[PDB]
Write a protein that binds this DNA or RNA. Structure first.
Lengths: 482, 418
DNA sequence: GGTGTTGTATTACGGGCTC
DNA sequence: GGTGTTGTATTACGGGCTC
DNA sequence: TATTTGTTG
DNA sequence: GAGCCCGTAATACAACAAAATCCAACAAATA
């Protein structure tokens, strides 16, 4: 009741095992690779195959014909004889003591990629997918801008947001103004202090998150009528707002420094933190963000040994030339910064390249007790390739919330594989309903359930309405949805 | 109200400034360093000091007398003239464009280690503060046991709630202890599942209430079982059980992707699969690390032999001795490999007595206490004992704090200054 | 179009001395 | 006494060929 | 028109 | 040097790091 109790006279290893017998040469279609391998064996010396009365094997390892390759890898990777769906190393440690397999490790990683569950249950450093591509460098004094929110701040006047940090990306002026959750939700007063910030110059590009305070229809349309883009994030990918969040990281330390009176009276400290942080020189540019835009430094001059040029508070008709010169200086420092970021981060990262049409797994941010249950969900078809690291995909039918996912969550899908066929008739959706595998959910627009069947096209689902839903046992269906 | 409006004929730079003046040399106590610096200046050629109407300075930067060093670095580090308590780089960028200060970087890092708020507020990767220094490897089989569990899973039918694991430090043998998130009957289930093999020598676990457990600890003291009892929010010591539940979580997801709420049936399959699969740091299946009797035997392994340990009856002593020797050297290899690939940046901290160390609001306050933008102003504690190479006990100025063991990943030793 | 980014101790590289 | 530790793609190093 | 219910900093 | 195949076999890199509630607030779905 084992394998190998069967003859196979037509496979790749025939030319290898007729080196001693030389009986018959029964090659098949596209089997000339066996003859080329035999020629390669003849021009070298690696002849060590042991041949004894149909027990043909290597020095201590049983060579396997290519017909039952899938049988062997399924035997020692799946659970028929206690495998466990492990990585390539454990699969080698199970197979390489027993079998030879020319290009063994390549075949093993191929089986790891072409499995049905093995892609979706495991993980291998998804954070480093996609090379680090910095956003466009700079513009004319914060025509590109970023902002973000962080919470958890203690109340003082029911003000438990208080972090609306806006970072003047070119000069990194990095303003932040006290606020609260309950003041506005981008309707009445949020825009008003947004404009009193913007009173010192309208921007031209926003980069922000998928927060509900900026995904609203009111915010996007008013910005579009203002001629300012949105460029939101990618469903819990705050690295798009990196420089604002890095400012927060610098802000948090200074907030703890100034936060001795944590509860009583401390809203005076945010303008103090602003004035301190802007005047302090940074690292990536060598000049303080206060003097990059405004030219001069603040009061009490501590003018350095360069020139008197940092005390530029005089006649303004010649400001344009040297302020543009400083713009050139800072621009050069930002190509240096982009190069420095791309050096030390892309060393381990590997880009992911997908064309439109191929399937892709999302592995997170699809269903918000997610410990033992299948938190990782099935494959979807990519629609729009916004960037090399930005794929728009159909995770559900048409429901909600910005169907583009960053490549960090995204993962390639491989369907190389007795698979069944595609039911298209009306009577084939009722009988072939007990062959289901997983579930996505219920359509919000009408009554139509989307699910996965077995040994079929995974992404190309078949619609199953209530007329063929109650007959099959649905007791085990909502268990994976709950 | 500006500075430098004062003459100082008694400082270190007097010997440097008399290279042009040669008039008065009123040196002070411990000013023999000025003599050596002047000698080094004389045997070299680096004369760039400018003497202009009491403003003695460098090529473009003002050298400052050592009397007002602390005043200047406090002025450019605190908010008196808008510093901000930043690091050495921003402090240099504030000072070095205007001042020279021989060995400025060392003076500034000394000031950073001097200023108290920078010690209490900054972190500067407080996860690399001690060497690896792993557990002692092993003894004879089933003598060291690692204990931990994940608190909550999606509940089954209301009889089982969470999974507890027992894997020994030597052989890493999986186990299926399915508890109910428990009571003092922990010793019942735990006894039934380790006493299948036998009583260990030490238990490597966390300070969990089911194991801190004064009722359960006295049982171990009477029976002859030690207790490492890894400190508050430092789960690294548990190790083998943590790595097993890492492997168990993937296995439990694999076997219960479509079969949630009844994973207790598949839990023995989880542990049997973990047991039959060879690992990397030992290279053998945990059956083979124990009495090697992989019962499935789908095919004979490499270096084909009898491979039937059932046939052997009395000669098992030499076989277990051979397995013990090779697995002990493999454990030592795993230890040294871990130490090499981890200690490339781990800076040691060896104090062992008489310091005033801190604990930066982790294992000091509650794990359930929320971490926020609230100030981190833990007071200067004290250390009285060297409990281990990688931790120091403290005299926690509270009611009891229920524990006083702090692993080096939270200390960040406080340094005073007269 | 839309996707990281600086603060920070820490450490590496040139003038000037001994050769 | 008491304090990390393996699974995993990924990548580096020897026999055998061309030299 | 109030009470819901998907998803997201 | 110079590269290539192939077959093992080391190799840093990250996951176990308690679990799961909402908070505030956009917009869909009925009745």
């Amino acid at each position: 009741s084992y394998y190998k109790s069967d003859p196979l006279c037509s496979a790749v290893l025939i030319h290898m095992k007729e080196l001693t017998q030389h009986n018959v040469t029964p090659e098949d279609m596209s089997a000339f690779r066996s003859y080329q391998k035999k020629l390669e064996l003849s021009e070298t010396f690696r002849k060590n195959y042991s041949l004894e009365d149909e027990m043909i094997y290597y020095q201590d390892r049983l060579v396997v014909p290519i017909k039952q390759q899938n049988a062997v890898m399924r035997l020692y990777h799946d659970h028929t004889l206690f495998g466990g769906h492990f990585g390539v190393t454990v699969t080698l440690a199970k197979i390489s003591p027993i079998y030879y397999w020319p290009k063994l490790q390549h075949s093993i990683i191929q089986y790891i990629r072409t499995c049905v569950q093995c892609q979706l249950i495991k993980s291998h450093r998804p954070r480093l997918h996609g090379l680090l591509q910095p956003l466009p460098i700079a513009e004319g004094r914060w025509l590109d801008i970023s902002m973000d929110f962080v919470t958890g701040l203690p109340p003082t006047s029911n003000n438990l947001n208080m972090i609306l940090v806006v970072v003047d990306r070119f000069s990194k002026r990095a303003h932040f103004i006290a606020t609260r959750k309950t003041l506005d939700a981008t309707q009445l007063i949020d825009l008003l202090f947004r404009y009193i910030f913007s009173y010192h110059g309208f921007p031209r590009t926003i980069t922000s998150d998928r927060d509900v305070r900026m995904t609203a229809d009111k915010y996007q349309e008013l910005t579009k009528r203002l001629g300012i883009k949105s460029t939101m994030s990618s469903a819990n990918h705050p690295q798009t707002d990196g420089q604002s969040e890095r400012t927060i990281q610098t802000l948090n330390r200074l907030l703890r420094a100034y936060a001795s009176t944590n509860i009583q009276n401390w809203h005076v400290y945010l303008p103090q933190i602003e004035f301190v942080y802007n005047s302090t020189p940074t690292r990536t540019l060598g000049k303080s963000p206060f003097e990059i835009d405004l030219g001069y430094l603040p009061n009490t001059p501590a003018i350095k040994s360069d020139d008197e040029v940092n005390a530029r508070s005089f006649t303004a008709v010649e400001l344009a030339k040297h302020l543009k010169a400083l713009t050139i200086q800072t621009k050069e420092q930002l190509e240096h910064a982009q190069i420095e970021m791309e050096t030390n981060n892309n060393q381990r990262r590997k880009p992911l390249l997908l064309n439109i049409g191929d399937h892709v797994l999302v592995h997170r941010d699809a269903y918000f007790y997610m410990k033992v249950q299948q938190i990782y969900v099935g494959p979807f078809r990519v629609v729009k390739k916004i960037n090399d690291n930005a794929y728009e995909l159909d995770l559900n039918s048409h429901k909600k919330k910005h169907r583009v996912i960053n490549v960090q969550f995204l993962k390639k899908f491989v369907y190389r594989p007795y698979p069944k066929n595609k039911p298209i008739s009306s009577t084939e959706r009722i009988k072939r309903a007990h062959e289901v595998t997983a579930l996505i959910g219920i359509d919000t627009t009408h009554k139509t359930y989307l699910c996965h069947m077995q040994d079929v096209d995974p992404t190309l689902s078949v619609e199953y309405s209530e007329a063929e839903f109650c007959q099959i046992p649905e007791r085990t269906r909502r268990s994976i949805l709950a």
